[PDB]
A = this chain, B = another copy of it.
Amino acid sequence: ANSMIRLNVFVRVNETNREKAIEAAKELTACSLKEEGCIAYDTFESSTRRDVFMICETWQNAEVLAAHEKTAHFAQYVGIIQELAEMKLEKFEF
């Protein structure tokens, strides 16, 4: 505080669900980028492991991140990804 926050969210997904999970992350990416406190947000697929992708995020501070996590689009798309795949969130401060 009032430091920026970097999230690295690693997602493991099978071949049946791979495209659907990535699309849901892509949809969540477009939604989150409209949030004022969202500094950066993108979905990245592993170039070496078909079953791995990640979400990289930068949040202005802890409070805009907390607000993000209370949004409808967050609940909707994270719910979807969690149903399709396994997620591990890692958080770091600048």
A contacts, CB < 8 Å to B = 6, 8, 22, 25-26, 29, 42-49, 52-54, 56, 90, 92-94
Contacts and interface: CB of A to CB of B under 8 A. Distances in A.
Contacts of A52: 42
A49 B45 contact: no
Contacts of A90: 6
A46 to B, nearest CB: 5
- Chain A contact residues: helix, strand, loop or mixed: strand
Nearest to A55: B47
Nearest to A29: B48
A62 to B, nearest CB: 15
A14 B66 CA distance: 36
A92 B90 CA distance: 11
Top 4 A-B pairs ranked by shortest CB distance? A44-B44, A92-B92, A43-B47, A42-B46
Contacts of A93: 92
